[PDB]
Design an enzyme around this catalytic site. Structure first.
Site, PDB file in Angstrom:
ATOM      1  N   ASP A   9      21.155 -26.393 -11.442  1.00 22.76           N
ATOM      2  CA  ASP A   9      21.784 -25.838 -10.250  1.00 22.76           C
ATOM      3  C   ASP A   9      23.256 -26.219 -10.290  1.00 22.76           C
ATOM      4  O   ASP A   9      23.597 -27.382 -10.523  1.00 22.76           O
ATOM      5  CB  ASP A   9      21.150 -26.417  -8.985  1.00 22.76           C
ATOM      6  CG  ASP A   9      19.792 -25.815  -8.687  1.00 22.76           C
ATOM      7  OD1 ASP A   9      19.127 -25.347  -9.634  1.00 22.76           O
ATOM      8  OD2 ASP A   9      19.384 -25.819  -7.508  1.00 22.76           O
ATOM      9  N   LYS A  66      19.568 -17.435  -6.046  1.00 28.23           N
ATOM     10  CA  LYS A  66      18.423 -17.345  -5.165  1.00 28.23           C
ATOM     11  C   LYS A  66      18.671 -16.538  -3.911  1.00 28.23           C
ATOM     12  O   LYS A  66      19.810 -16.368  -3.464  1.00 28.23           O
ATOM     13  CB  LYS A  66      17.900 -18.742  -4.807  1.00 28.23           C
ATOM     14  CG  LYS A  66      18.943 -19.752  -4.419  1.00 28.23           C
ATOM     15  CD  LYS A  66      18.313 -21.144  -4.312  1.00 28.23           C
ATOM     16  CE  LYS A  66      17.653 -21.544  -5.623  1.00 28.23           C
ATOM     17  NZ  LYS A  66      17.059 -22.903  -5.587  1.00 28.23           N
ATOM     18  N   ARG A 150      -0.758 -30.761 -11.355  1.00 32.65           N
ATOM     19  CA  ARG A 150      -2.143 -31.240 -11.477  1.00 32.65           C
ATOM     20  C   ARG A 150      -3.081 -30.219 -10.840  1.00 32.65           C
ATOM     21  O   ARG A 150      -4.093 -29.840 -11.429  1.00 32.65           O
ATOM     22  CB  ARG A 150      -2.344 -32.579 -10.755  1.00 32.65           C
ATOM     23  CG  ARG A 150      -1.754 -33.793 -11.449  1.00 32.65           C
ATOM     24  CD  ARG A 150      -2.439 -34.057 -12.770  1.00 32.65           C
ATOM     25  NE  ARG A 150      -2.120 -35.380 -13.299  1.00 32.65           N
ATOM     26  CZ  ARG A 150      -2.483 -35.801 -14.507  1.00 32.65           C
ATOM     27  NH1 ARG A 150      -3.174 -34.999 -15.311  1.00 32.65           N
ATOM     28  NH2 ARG A 150      -2.159 -37.021 -14.911  1.00 32.65           N
ATOM     29  N   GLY A 257      18.077 -29.703  -9.910  1.00 35.11           N
ATOM     30  CA  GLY A 257      19.111 -29.386  -8.947  1.00 35.11           C
ATOM     31  C   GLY A 257      19.939 -30.591  -8.563  1.00 35.11           C
ATOM     32  O   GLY A 257      21.059 -30.791  -9.049  1.00 35.11           O
ATOM     33  N   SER A 258      19.363 -31.414  -7.696  1.00 31.48           N
ATOM     34  CA  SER A 258      20.024 -32.608  -7.192  1.00 31.48           C
ATOM     35  C   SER A 258      20.153 -33.726  -8.226  1.00 31.48           C
ATOM     36  O   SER A 258      21.192 -34.388  -8.311  1.00 31.48           O
ATOM     37  CB  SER A 258      19.255 -33.119  -5.973  1.00 31.48           C
ATOM     38  OG  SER A 258      18.891 -32.038  -5.129  1.00 31.48           O
TER      39      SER A 258
END
Ligand SMILES: [Cl-]
Ligand SMILES: [Cl-]
Ligand SMILES: [Cl-]
Ligand SMILES: [Cl-]
Ligand SMILES: [Cl-]
Ligand SMILES: [Cl-]
Ligand SMILES: [Cl-]
Ligand SMILES: [Cl-]
Ligand SMILES: [Cl-]
EC number: 4.3.3.6
Lengths: 299, 307, 299
Positions: A9, A66, A150, A257-258
């Site tokens: 990002d 997005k 999972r 992203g972060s």
């Protein structure tokens, strides 16, 4: 379409170039990183087209953008300016509370998030070309990404043990989510919250046709032993080890992203995650790139 | 008026109605291409700590004199006198709105006895049909004014479209059943009062409950509007989207969902470049089916509102 | 196949001839009249083939015979000896508690009883060529025949007001009765009493195929405003007025068992019921034939 690697990002030209310099396979152009979106609050929308185009001109790798869930005109805008892939994400403020965009009528490919098999099948049937098994973006906590991968793996493992007739039963169950609006409205008109399976509810498709549609996607999943589209893990990847963990769980790649720009050394951190993703099965490499990496995002 | 009420409404369709608080904004709205303006002392985003009432008639008249396009004004729900005041000063249309503090908890204004046309908000088909039977000449499928979040406007248009689609599959007898259900809301006061007098919270269908009409007569009235809705496949009056329109793409989205036009309140003057923003929303509304145009007018617009 | 008239139950050659002499359109050969079957008790089965053949040789009108519900070999026997129509009736002791005979694979026509639209549609889909809207045989009380004809008429009147999509919903509901065995068995195996719509449950047909089958029959009913096969009223007809009442309710004809031979003057009584059935809209005739008719069956 990307098949391996790390998608990063970026919020400006400098970050987009850093991402490419680090080895990103593509970038996700947006005005606010997910971590800052959760804190800031307010209404998160499609980024200014001008910013996205500036990023497109600044790099030689694919650029994604997005749009809000259900916001088909935001998506038509992203397609018009030529982004390589649109990401209909829950990271932004949902625009339509009942339906996602009917992605099949678009030319540009879409990537959609999914927390479980039902969501993945529904997003794929509506047109998604890539799936993002997401957990919780902006937290820096890999558990959410792990929980969902999972759930995804176990659901597919159980689906492979079913007969086609049992798979149809699953398809029928997954299709019910589409009739929520029809039932709500009927109740609002003073009648039972039920629907007839042969009445249109989504893009002209009846519940019965939607079931056959989800059923065909589930048969692909059963035969493949995995989703019939590229599937990346996202949300929570903050360290090289996190990235490698997702790959060991079966991810085709990762979205970050972060974790990168909200850390101390973005470039170095990004390169490390890229190396760990390509060498997820080599502990020595994962260890070396994690060495002296500096402060990671809080979360 | 009868024919004159719907006459005015059909000339605003396809356009953008903008909320303005002064002469400068009204003028900006006009040069931007608005079909009309909604005069008020404070936009919905600011409205939401105290009691929001009708705007000073002087402020509305100043705005009426500042622009050549039609002017609307808001009155509190059920406030017959505020509405009578707005009609006397000559506004082009009155908006009985929920953005203002409701004045009557039981009933909306009986709009049919007025000369000036009314626009009313509606969250679903039942509300639209009751407002229309009451006299509304225009409906705005409202959402959440002041939030800049289009989701509310989308939710209600989705509900409206789906309900109308289901209505068209019903026989007239089944539609009557829906009208009967929709009319119950009018007997709330009667039932509450009966209970307060120590009796069952029920009502007789031939007793007057609203503007001299009995429940039975109200059901027939709602039934007739529903038949029109069924025949047309849409509301029998102009239907605009209102709520969180904050970007050109939002306006285009509402139009693609079937809206005849859009109301924009906080989205324009609570943004960085009002005039430019207003112009872009106007063009996106007129060319909602033109991705290239929508994209073009969205480039370099600056910061928008939030909430 | 008979289309109008009175079908009479006979237990011997003398009664069969009396029936024909009276004007019966056909006879129903059996060893025990319904009224005597309810009292006697025991297990009521298919009559001796020898008795049926003796009756066939004694008259020049069609001869019918009944078999137990679900007893396909009793039916194959009746077909082999050449009866004109087989009546799978609840008058006899049911042989299969889960399924009725799959009448479509037979050459000889079947008449089946039905208490409501759902039963009629199901019997018709399995092959019935004629329906007997029955109430309670052996009682001599016309109310049961009336209750069911009322239920039948009202159901069809309501079906004609439905869209095809709503009719399918009715078909789906009527189809559930066929999955009773499958659910019982699954529960007996320690699993939920549910079924998959694509698994065989009746004659190789899946629940889904049965639904489409009942749906096609219901569409015929909707279009016709009546059952697509001949429909006679039965059970309880004891007087000429009873017969005329059923005809006024829409019956194509009537079946009479106990009412005739369990009365004082069988021949005279039979002729009267025949005349009343042909002139159900002529009170003077119905009145005249009821005059001095003698004692009627008790019940
Ligand atoms: Cl979903
Ligand atoms: Cl259905
Ligand atoms: Cl997968
Ligand atoms: Cl209301
Ligand atoms: Cl009453
Ligand atoms: Cl409409
Ligand atoms: Cl049955
Ligand atoms: Cl199933
Ligand atoms: Cl019939």
């Amino acid at each position: 379409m990307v098949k391996h690697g790390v998608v990063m990002d970026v919020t400006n030209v400098e970050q987009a170039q850093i991402a490419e310099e680090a080895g990103a396979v593509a970038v996700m152009a947006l005005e606010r990183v997910p971590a800052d979106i959760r804190a800031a609050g307010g209404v998160a929308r499609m980024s200014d087209p001008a910013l996205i185009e500036e990023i497109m001109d600044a790099v030689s790798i694919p650029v994604m953008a997005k749009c809000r869930i259900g916001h088909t005109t935001e998506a038509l805008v992203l397609e018009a300016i030529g982004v390589d892939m649109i990401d209909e994400s829950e990271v932004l403020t949902q625009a339509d509370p009942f339906f996602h965009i009917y992605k099949k009528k678009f030319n540009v490919p879409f990537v959609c998030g999914a927390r479980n098999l039902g969501e993945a099948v529904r997003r794929i049937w509506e047109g998604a070309a890539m799936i993002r098994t997401k957990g919780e973006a902006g937290t820096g906590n890999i558990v959410e990404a792990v929980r969902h991968m999972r759930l995804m793996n176990e659901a597919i493992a159980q689906l492979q043990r079913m007969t086609d007739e049992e798979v149809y039963g699953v398809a029928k169950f997954y299709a019910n989510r589409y009739a929520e609006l029809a039932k709500t409205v009927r109740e609002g008109m003073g009648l039972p919250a039920t629907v007839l399976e042969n009445e249109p509810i989504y893009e002209g498709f009846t519940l019965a046709e939607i079931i056959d549609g989800l059923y065909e996607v589930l048969l692909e999943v059963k035969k493949l032993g995995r989703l019939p589209v590229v599937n990346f893990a996202a949300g929570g990847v903050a360290t090289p080890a996190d990235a490698a963990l997702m790959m060991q769980l079966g991810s085709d790649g990762v979205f970050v992203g972060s974790g990168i720009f909200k850390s101390e050394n973005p470039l170095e951190r990004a390169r490390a995650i890229v190396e760990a993703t390509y060498n997820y099965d080599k502990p020595d490499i994962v260890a070396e790139v994690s060495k002296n990496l500096g402060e990671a995002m809080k979360g």
